[PDB]
Amino acid sequence: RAVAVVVDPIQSVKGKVVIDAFRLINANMMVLGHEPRQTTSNLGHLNKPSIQALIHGLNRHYYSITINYRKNELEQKMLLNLHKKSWMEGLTLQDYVVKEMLELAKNYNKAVEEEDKMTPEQLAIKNVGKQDPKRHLEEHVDVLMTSNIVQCLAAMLDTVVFK
Amino acid sequence: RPANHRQLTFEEIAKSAKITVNEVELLVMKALSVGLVKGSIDEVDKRVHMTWVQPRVLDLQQIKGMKDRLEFWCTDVKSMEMLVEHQAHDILT
Amino acid sequence: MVLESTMVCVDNSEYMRNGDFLPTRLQAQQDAVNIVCHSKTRSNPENNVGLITLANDCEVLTTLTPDTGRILSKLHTVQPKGKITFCTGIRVAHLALKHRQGKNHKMRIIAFVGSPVEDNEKDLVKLAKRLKKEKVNVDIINFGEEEVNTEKLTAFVNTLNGKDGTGSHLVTVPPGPSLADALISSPILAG
Amino acid sequence: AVQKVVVHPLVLLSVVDHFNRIGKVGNQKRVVGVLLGSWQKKVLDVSNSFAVPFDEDDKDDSVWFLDHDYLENMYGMFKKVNARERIVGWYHTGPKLHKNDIAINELMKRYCPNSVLVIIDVKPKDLGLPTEAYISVEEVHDDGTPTSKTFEHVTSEIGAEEAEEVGVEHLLRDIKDTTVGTLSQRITNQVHGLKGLNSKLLDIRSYLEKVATGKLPINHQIIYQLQDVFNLLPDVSLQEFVKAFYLKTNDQMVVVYLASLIRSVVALHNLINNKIANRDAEKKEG
Amino acid sequence: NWAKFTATASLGVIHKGHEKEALQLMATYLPKDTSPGSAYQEGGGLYALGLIHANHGGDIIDYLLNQLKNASNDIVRHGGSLGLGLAAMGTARQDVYDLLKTNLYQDDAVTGEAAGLALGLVMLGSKNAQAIEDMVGYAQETQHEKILRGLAVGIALVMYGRMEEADALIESLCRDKDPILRRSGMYTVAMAYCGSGNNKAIRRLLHVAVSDVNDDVRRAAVESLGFILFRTPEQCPSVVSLLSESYNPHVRYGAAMALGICCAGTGNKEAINLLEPMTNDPVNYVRQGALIASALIMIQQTEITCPKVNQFRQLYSKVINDKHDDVMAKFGAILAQGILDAGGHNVTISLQSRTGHTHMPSVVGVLVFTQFWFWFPLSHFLSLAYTPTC
């Protein structure tokens, strides 16, 4: 096969699948049809994005190939063990900061809350005759939820650890 | 002594010390000059407050009493921990 | 030529330092390493020679490799000092030769013992019928001093072979003044 | 001599593949391979490593084999293609060490004068972080024995490097990112309570080992002293924190003030749009 | 491959029935009388003989099993093995259990899938306790996608209409690795609950349909409702319309297939009305599959009942008379036309007869018809889902 491997090392931190692989088909088979691929249904299920418009310019005797990221039962669950059980508090016993994020969160909440409450000045009737619908409850439900619940469990740390 | 008493009288230090009242002050300051205790010199009542001390040799009976109060801590915090988690068990989903 | 693997088993115990055997006993076993490495240069260079001790450790510093110029550099500062254990020496050399590269090479190994080893004859007969079930002839050349007429290693020579595989030749040590090449002249005559 | 380590998972997978290389053949004991490293501070880093063949019979745990020629050859390879790296130690896959490991350590402490091992587990379920560090120094002894050459447990971690998780978090695919607000805290509660107080109860099982046994190093030097660092709180009955209930109320104070005020404002968040859009949808639905 | 195989297979699709004249009509088309490209002008000949002798076998055990036993490799034996299992239902064929596993020895190309299918068809709803062991304690230790997916379809096919009798094994398939046994557990509960409104399958069905991160198994899990809900088909569209708006073309594609394979004997206007914006999708092949399912929904269907017949015919004209559509949209379009006039509006599909007995080759045909990513004559088996309405 002699399959190439093409990569760009400046892309992302967890997401991109940057690797690219090919198969140059010969110019001697210019008589016969180009890339038969007996079924061309999983090849069509490879064909999904029509990726890399300059390579699709380079579709003269080129095509990318399927690369799955297959399982290693010998390795997958233990990589998951490494990953999770080394990132859930490391030893899982460490933090179970807290007293200045009080002021940080009250700033980050209230300073956005007054502009969150400005818009009922401008709310009215004649349904489409007004145009500015934007939500305002964002990051003051959930940031306050996570903030205050985790720091009241931080107030529970003393009774949890200490007796 | 039982855990610390949190405040320890001049009679106690002077009685184990077989010394007068007016030397346990020099004693606790001298212990600070030694640097084995970080204590607060509670002598508004001549009754002294305790901090960390450099320990002495754990005896066999002190291994056993350490097992006693230590497993007291261990299984009490573990059992009441399982009770807290038994109340916290209903909302996992 | 012939395909084998000979593991030189030097002694680095504290008995190999005097001059009863010629102007250094270190030089005596060193000339022995010289003649066996030149002899395996004169043998097939497809074969391989590695170093090992029996005393104070089981010291592998070179691999069982067909080169020996680095072994000639490894002659220096051997500093023979410790306590002999040849009974682990046979087995450590045999696993070193079960870490080889080819099976068409035979296994004719030499050994140099120069100290009183706490070796039961039951130990070395376990090793000896082990080599009967592992196909190794061993030609030991006694150095140093343990006995003027060695018997435990004579028993290993007896209990290694029978009727076909008599490749156990034991040069017992001549504990008085005997030469540097007169000891190794008989195995270069017949191993 | 070693402050801590910064160890990437790539070298652990580089252990895993050679574990695959030995699971298909006659496996006598375990894997002994080279651990390269990027030693910069008294902290440690590893970017990569490779293995070396190894067998070991068990009669006097002294028959054990490496190939220093092969080792230094592939070291010269990876040193030429990357001059950052150098050897820093070794590793083994069997989670319990044995007495031959000091001979392994001191026999490879000749290239660089430190050689830190790495315990790992190819089937880990109960441990915390796989990565472990020892160092071979001497305290000689209280009884000052002839060279009590002891492995000394250096602290360890899994390291971190930018964009090395590109494969990882794409592969595993199952991660629920940012579960703050749900059940991560109680997973840490179950595991830290139970799985730390079982470490505590096995410490007191080791105390029962000191009761019925344990003459050996009974260890009245570090055990009760770091346990006195614990015994900063002798938490006996009557609970002794009359001088801390008001401090606990002070802990409750600010957070419950935030809770009261802010969640009243959260009801005030929900109700407005809920009522307005609710009756909008309700009586403008037809 | 399929030029050869489809060319000699469409003749046998045309020769459905045709009991006696097979040999003296394919005298030129014996496996040794053709000289194929590689193996499929000689494979599809025995495939067409299996289609000719579908469910009515004469010498189509000994004859076929010998000519596959006297066959060069595994790369030929395919269609003969499929029709062999198809005609060998309940004939207690032992060689189909004997020589297939030791014919592959580890795996095959696609005739390992054929092996799973053949033993499943001869052991339909059997609880083949010999082959519970010798299939699902076998589908773990090799590595490819074809062999494992085909044994997955085979261990789906071996268990059928069980209604209780497999479900611990099904969750034992659920606790396995990513692409194989969970997928097959979905297909096996899709076959074990055929004809009933059991609310047991729907639990793990919806659960693995949306909670999972592998997406083909999600597509399978939303395919399963048409397999289990054909007796009372008027339950699906009102709730699969919400499945129609998923993130992925996987679940949207299966949601387009579900309205079809649930109700294709009927011409309900609402399922048509909800297929309409689904064949107005941005993604191409989900529209393709929606059109396929609507061609299934409009077989035999006059215009006087629901007038969308001519609407979708001229829409098929629209998608077939332009070039800038999907590549296999035309594949699906003339497929939709051949389905749309099947026999000349003579045959139809029904997974269930009127008297309460099911019509099991129709169920087999649709579960066959879904997995056309390889072995395209899974489409060819939709002749087996056709009925004598006379």
Short mmCIF file of C-alpha atoms in Angstrom, two decimals, chain D residues 25-282:
data_model
loop_
_atom_site.label_atom_id
_atom_site.label_comp_id
_atom_site.label_asym_id
_atom_site.label_seq_id
_atom_site.Cartn_x
_atom_site.Cartn_y
_atom_site.Cartn_z
CA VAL D 25 5.46 -15.18 24.80
CA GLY D 26 6.65 -17.18 27.79
CA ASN D 27 6.39 -14.64 30.60
CA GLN D 28 8.44 -15.71 33.61
CA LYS D 29 8.14 -12.70 35.89
CA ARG D 30 7.73 -9.17 34.48
CA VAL D 31 9.11 -6.32 32.34
CA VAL D 32 12.33 -4.42 33.03
CA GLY D 33 12.88 -1.58 30.58
CA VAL D 34 14.74 1.71 30.33
CA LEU D 35 13.26 4.95 31.65
CA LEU D 36 14.62 7.99 29.85
CA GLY D 37 14.00 11.43 31.31
CA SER D 38 14.22 15.19 30.96
CA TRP D 39 15.83 16.24 34.25
CA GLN D 40 15.90 20.04 34.50
CA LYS D 41 15.33 21.20 38.10
CA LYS D 42 15.29 18.92 41.14
CA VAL D 43 11.84 18.26 39.59
CA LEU D 44 11.78 15.54 36.92
CA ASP D 45 10.21 15.07 33.49
CA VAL D 46 9.97 12.12 31.11
CA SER D 47 9.07 12.48 27.45
CA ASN D 48 9.75 8.98 26.14
CA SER D 49 11.45 5.66 26.91
CA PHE D 50 12.06 2.20 25.49
CA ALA D 51 12.54 -1.33 26.79
CA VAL D 52 15.26 -3.99 27.02
CA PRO D 53 14.86 -7.81 27.23
CA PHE D 54 15.00 -9.45 30.64
CA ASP D 55 14.57 -12.84 32.32
CA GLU D 56 14.97 -13.88 35.94
CA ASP D 57 15.05 -17.28 37.62
CA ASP D 58 14.25 -17.43 41.32
CA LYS D 59 16.97 -19.32 43.17
CA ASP D 60 19.14 -16.50 44.55
CA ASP D 61 17.52 -13.45 42.74
CA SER D 62 20.84 -12.55 41.14
CA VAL D 63 20.33 -14.18 37.75
CA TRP D 64 18.82 -11.29 35.79
CA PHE D 65 19.83 -9.98 32.40
CA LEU D 66 19.95 -6.77 30.40
CA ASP D 67 21.86 -5.72 27.25
CA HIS D 68 23.89 -2.60 27.96
CA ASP D 69 25.25 -2.62 24.42
CA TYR D 70 21.71 -2.52 22.97
CA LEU D 71 20.74 -0.04 25.69
CA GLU D 72 23.51 2.41 24.85
CA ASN D 73 22.95 1.93 21.11
CA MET D 74 19.30 2.93 21.17
CA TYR D 75 20.23 5.58 23.73
CA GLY D 76 22.67 6.97 21.16
CA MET D 77 19.85 6.83 18.60
CA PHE D 78 17.32 8.75 20.64
CA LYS D 79 20.03 11.07 21.96
CA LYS D 80 21.05 11.99 18.42
CA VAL D 81 17.50 12.46 17.17
CA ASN D 82 16.63 14.33 20.40
CA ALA D 83 19.43 15.86 22.46
CA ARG D 84 16.98 16.92 25.19
CA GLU D 85 16.48 13.43 26.60
CA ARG D 86 18.76 11.27 28.75
CA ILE D 87 18.28 8.16 30.85
CA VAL D 88 16.80 8.71 34.28
CA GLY D 89 15.90 5.22 35.48
CA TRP D 90 13.83 2.12 34.76
CA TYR D 91 10.38 0.64 35.34
CA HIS D 92 8.65 -2.61 36.18
CA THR D 93 5.10 -3.82 35.69
CA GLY D 94 4.64 -6.04 38.74
CA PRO D 95 3.21 -3.72 41.39
CA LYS D 96 5.12 -5.25 44.33
CA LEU D 97 8.89 -4.75 44.37
CA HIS D 98 11.34 -7.48 45.33
CA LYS D 99 14.87 -7.79 46.66
CA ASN D 100 16.57 -8.02 43.24
CA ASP D 101 15.43 -4.46 42.49
CA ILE D 102 18.28 -2.91 44.46
CA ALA D 103 20.74 -4.87 42.29
CA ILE D 104 18.91 -3.59 39.21
CA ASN D 105 19.01 -0.04 40.60
CA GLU D 106 22.67 0.05 41.56
CA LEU D 107 23.68 -1.76 38.39
CA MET D 108 22.11 0.97 36.27
CA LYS D 109 23.10 3.85 38.56
CA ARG D 110 26.51 3.72 36.86
CA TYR D 111 25.50 5.61 33.70
CA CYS D 112 23.85 8.43 35.45
CA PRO D 113 24.29 8.30 39.26
CA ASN D 114 20.52 8.31 39.80
CA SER D 115 18.08 5.73 38.42
CA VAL D 116 14.50 6.16 39.62
CA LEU D 117 12.20 3.21 39.02
CA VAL D 118 8.54 3.34 38.02
CA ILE D 119 6.01 0.92 39.43
CA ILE D 120 3.01 0.62 37.12
CA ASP D 121 0.05 -1.69 36.77
CA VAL D 122 -1.17 -3.07 33.47
CA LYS D 123 -4.43 -4.02 35.23
CA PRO D 124 -5.00 -1.14 37.69
CA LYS D 125 -8.27 -0.93 39.56
CA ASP D 126 -7.74 0.00 43.21
CA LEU D 127 -4.63 2.21 43.18
CA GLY D 128 -4.55 5.97 42.70
CA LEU D 129 -1.83 7.24 40.42
CA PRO D 130 0.26 4.49 38.77
CA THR D 131 3.46 6.56 38.75
CA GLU D 132 5.76 5.96 41.71
CA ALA D 133 9.27 7.13 42.57
CA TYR D 134 11.95 5.71 44.82
CA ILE D 135 15.52 6.87 45.39
CA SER D 136 18.40 4.88 46.89
CA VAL D 137 19.94 6.88 49.73
CA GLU D 138 20.89 5.97 53.29
CA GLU D 139 19.85 7.19 56.74
CA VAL D 140 22.21 4.74 57.60
CA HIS D 141 20.29 3.42 60.63
CA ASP D 142 19.70 4.13 64.30
CA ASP D 143 21.75 0.96 64.91
CA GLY D 144 24.00 2.10 62.00
CA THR D 145 24.04 -1.17 60.06
CA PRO D 146 26.61 -2.04 57.36
CA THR D 147 25.10 -0.11 54.45
CA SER D 148 21.29 -0.23 54.81
CA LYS D 149 20.78 0.89 51.21
CA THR D 150 17.11 1.80 51.13
CA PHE D 151 14.73 2.81 48.40
CA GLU D 152 13.20 6.11 49.52
CA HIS D 153 9.68 6.90 48.33
CA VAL D 154 9.85 10.16 46.40
CA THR D 155 6.55 11.88 45.68
CA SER D 156 5.05 11.47 42.23
CA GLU D 157 2.24 12.49 39.87
CA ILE D 158 0.98 12.27 36.31
CA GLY D 159 2.53 15.14 34.40
CA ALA D 160 0.99 17.56 31.97
CA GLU D 161 1.94 18.92 28.56
CA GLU D 162 0.11 21.17 26.12
CA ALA D 163 -1.74 19.37 23.31
CA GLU D 164 -0.71 15.87 24.33
CA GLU D 165 -4.37 15.06 25.00
CA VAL D 166 -5.36 15.57 21.34
CA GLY D 167 -5.43 11.83 20.86
CA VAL D 168 -6.54 11.06 24.39
CA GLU D 169 -9.76 12.99 24.95
CA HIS D 170 -10.79 12.36 21.36
CA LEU D 171 -10.28 8.61 21.89
CA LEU D 172 -12.00 8.11 25.22
CA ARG D 173 -15.07 10.12 24.11
CA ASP D 174 -17.01 9.39 27.31
CA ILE D 175 -15.88 12.36 29.39
CA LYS D 176 -18.61 14.45 31.00
CA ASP D 177 -16.74 17.75 31.10
CA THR D 178 -17.44 20.13 34.03
CA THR D 179 -19.70 18.11 36.31
CA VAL D 180 -19.38 20.90 38.89
CA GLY D 181 -22.90 21.10 40.24
CA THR D 182 -23.56 17.35 40.17
CA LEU D 183 -22.27 14.25 41.96
CA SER D 184 -18.51 14.66 41.45
CA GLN D 185 -18.33 15.89 45.02
CA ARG D 186 -20.08 12.79 46.33
CA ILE D 187 -17.90 10.49 44.23
CA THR D 188 -14.98 12.18 45.99
CA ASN D 189 -16.90 11.78 49.26
CA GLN D 190 -17.40 8.02 48.88
CA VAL D 191 -13.90 7.43 47.65
CA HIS D 192 -12.07 9.69 50.07
CA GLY D 193 -14.02 8.60 53.17
CA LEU D 194 -14.04 4.88 52.38
CA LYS D 195 -10.80 4.56 50.37
CA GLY D 196 -8.82 6.74 52.77
CA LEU D 197 -10.18 5.38 56.00
CA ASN D 198 -9.49 1.90 54.66
CA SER D 199 -5.91 3.03 54.21
CA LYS D 200 -6.29 4.16 57.82
CA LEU D 201 -7.80 0.83 58.89
CA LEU D 202 -5.03 -1.04 57.10
CA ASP D 203 -2.59 1.22 58.92
CA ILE D 204 -4.25 0.01 62.10
CA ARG D 205 -4.08 -3.50 60.65
CA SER D 206 -0.35 -2.82 60.41
CA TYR D 207 -0.67 -1.70 64.02
CA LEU D 208 -2.12 -5.14 64.74
CA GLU D 209 0.91 -6.40 62.84
CA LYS D 210 2.93 -4.45 65.43
CA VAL D 211 0.80 -6.08 68.14
CA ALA D 212 1.03 -9.76 67.16
CA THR D 213 4.25 -9.30 65.13
CA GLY D 214 6.30 -6.33 64.04
CA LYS D 215 9.55 -6.66 66.00
CA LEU D 216 11.29 -6.08 62.69
CA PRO D 217 11.71 -2.36 62.18
CA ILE D 218 8.86 -1.61 64.69
CA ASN D 219 9.69 2.00 63.68
CA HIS D 220 9.25 4.28 66.69
CA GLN D 221 10.94 7.11 64.78
CA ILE D 222 8.68 8.37 61.98
CA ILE D 223 5.36 6.59 62.69
CA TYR D 224 4.19 8.25 65.90
CA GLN D 225 5.81 11.54 64.94
CA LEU D 226 3.88 12.00 61.71
CA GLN D 227 0.95 10.52 63.62
CA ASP D 228 1.51 13.34 66.11
CA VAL D 229 1.19 15.69 63.15
CA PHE D 230 -2.15 13.91 62.86
CA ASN D 231 -2.60 14.14 66.66
CA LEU D 232 -2.82 17.88 66.30
CA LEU D 233 -6.52 16.91 66.68
CA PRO D 234 -7.11 14.34 69.47
CA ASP D 235 -10.83 14.24 68.67
CA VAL D 236 -12.16 12.41 71.72
CA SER D 237 -15.75 12.58 73.01
CA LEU D 238 -17.26 15.85 74.38
CA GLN D 239 -15.90 17.02 70.97
CA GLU D 240 -13.84 19.94 72.45
CA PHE D 241 -14.91 22.60 69.88
CA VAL D 242 -16.89 25.04 71.97
CA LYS D 243 -14.28 27.43 70.59
CA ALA D 244 -15.24 26.43 67.04
CA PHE D 245 -19.05 26.31 66.85
CA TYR D 246 -19.05 30.10 66.36
CA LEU D 247 -16.33 29.70 63.75
CA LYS D 248 -18.53 27.11 62.02
CA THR D 249 -21.41 29.58 62.18
CA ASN D 250 -19.01 32.10 60.63
CA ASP D 251 -18.38 29.49 57.94
CA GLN D 252 -22.13 29.12 57.42
CA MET D 253 -22.64 32.91 57.62
CA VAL D 254 -21.51 34.36 54.32
CA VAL D 255 -22.53 31.42 52.13
CA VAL D 256 -26.07 31.34 53.53
CA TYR D 257 -26.28 35.11 53.07
CA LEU D 258 -25.32 34.57 49.43
CA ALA D 259 -27.83 31.72 49.23
CA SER D 260 -30.73 33.78 50.65
CA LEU D 261 -30.12 36.95 48.64
CA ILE D 262 -28.99 35.36 45.40
CA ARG D 263 -31.58 32.57 45.19
CA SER D 264 -34.31 35.10 45.93
CA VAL D 265 -32.88 36.93 42.92
CA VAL D 266 -32.91 33.56 41.08
CA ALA D 267 -36.65 33.15 41.70
CA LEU D 268 -36.82 36.74 40.48
CA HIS D 269 -34.90 35.58 37.39
CA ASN D 270 -37.21 32.69 36.54
CA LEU D 271 -40.64 34.16 37.27
CA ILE D 272 -40.54 37.15 34.90
CA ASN D 273 -39.88 35.44 31.59
CA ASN D 274 -41.74 32.36 32.78
CA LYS D 275 -45.00 34.23 33.47
CA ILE D 276 -44.78 36.51 30.43
CA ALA D 277 -43.84 33.86 27.85
CA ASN D 278 -46.12 31.39 29.63
CA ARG D 279 -49.32 33.35 29.11
CA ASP D 280 -48.01 34.51 25.73
CA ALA D 281 -47.88 30.87 24.60
CA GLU D 282 -51.08 30.07 26.50
#
